[PDB]
Amino acid sequence: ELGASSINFVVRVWSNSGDLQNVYWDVLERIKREFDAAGISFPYPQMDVNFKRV
Amino acid sequence: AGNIINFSREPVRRNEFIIGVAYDSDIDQVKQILTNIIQSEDRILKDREMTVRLNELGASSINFVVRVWSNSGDLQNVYWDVLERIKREFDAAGISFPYPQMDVNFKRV
Amino acid sequence: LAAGVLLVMFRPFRAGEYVDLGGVAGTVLSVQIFSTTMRTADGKIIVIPNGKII
Numbered sequence A: 001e002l003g004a005s006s007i008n009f010v011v012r013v014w015s016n017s018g019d020l021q022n023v024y025w026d027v028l029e030r031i032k033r034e035f036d037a038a039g040i041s042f043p044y045p046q047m048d049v050n051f052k053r054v
Numbered sequence B: 001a002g003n004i005i006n007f008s009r010e011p012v013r014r015n016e017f018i019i020g021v022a023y024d025s026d027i028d029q030v031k032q033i034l035t036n037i038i039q040s041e042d043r044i045l046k047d048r049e050m051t052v053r054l055n056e057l058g059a060s061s062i063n064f065v066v067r068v069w070s071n072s073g074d075l076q077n078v079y080w081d082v083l084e085r086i087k088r089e090f091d092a093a094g095i096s097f098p099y100p101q102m103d104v105n106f107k108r109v
Numbered sequence C: 001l002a003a004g005v006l007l008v009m010f011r012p013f014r015a016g017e018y019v020d021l022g023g024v025a026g027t028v029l030s031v032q033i034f035s036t037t038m039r040t041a042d043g044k045i046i047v048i049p050n051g052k053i054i
């Protein structure tokens, strides 16, 4: 999807019902670490402001 | 003709904290601080599961989740004590709870 | 009573199985004649009439 302030990626993976939450947490933490190290940036809410009556 | 949510039935219940810190906060430091906070409370049952780990990448912060079990009589008290201690430790350690954030791009300067 | 009999005969769930009986989720503790008892992940006990479940 092309969101308002970011482009959302989707990741879907299958795992045993006993390892669902654990794999979710591990993958999320690893995703954050890799993106921080690689350069990819999670963006804050964005907004273009046009000034008038300066 | 409806569900009957009984609380006083089970002698042990769970507390859930949602802590949102800045995006530059060290994950390892936050996890260690939370673990030390929840391991020093004597009213938190150590037999049960004590989960503290990154739970979500919010719009302005990364939310951590803390889950701890305690007797039904000590639920609210442990919640309040743990919340106050969390705030104090984060303030002393350096971790910062962020205000709502927003990137503004200027035009027609 | 009829719903409980049906749930005993046809077994959509058994004691110890995580289920979501219409907006409420938790491990099933026991199925009885008039209602079944489940324990939500939070740690509280919920009693649901069998007819509503069915």
Ligand SMILES: CCCCCCCCCCCC
Pocket: C001, C002, C005, C006, C009
């Ligand atoms: C009080 C009524 C008890 C009987 C409920 C009906 C059970 C029908 C089962 C049919 C299985 C094929």
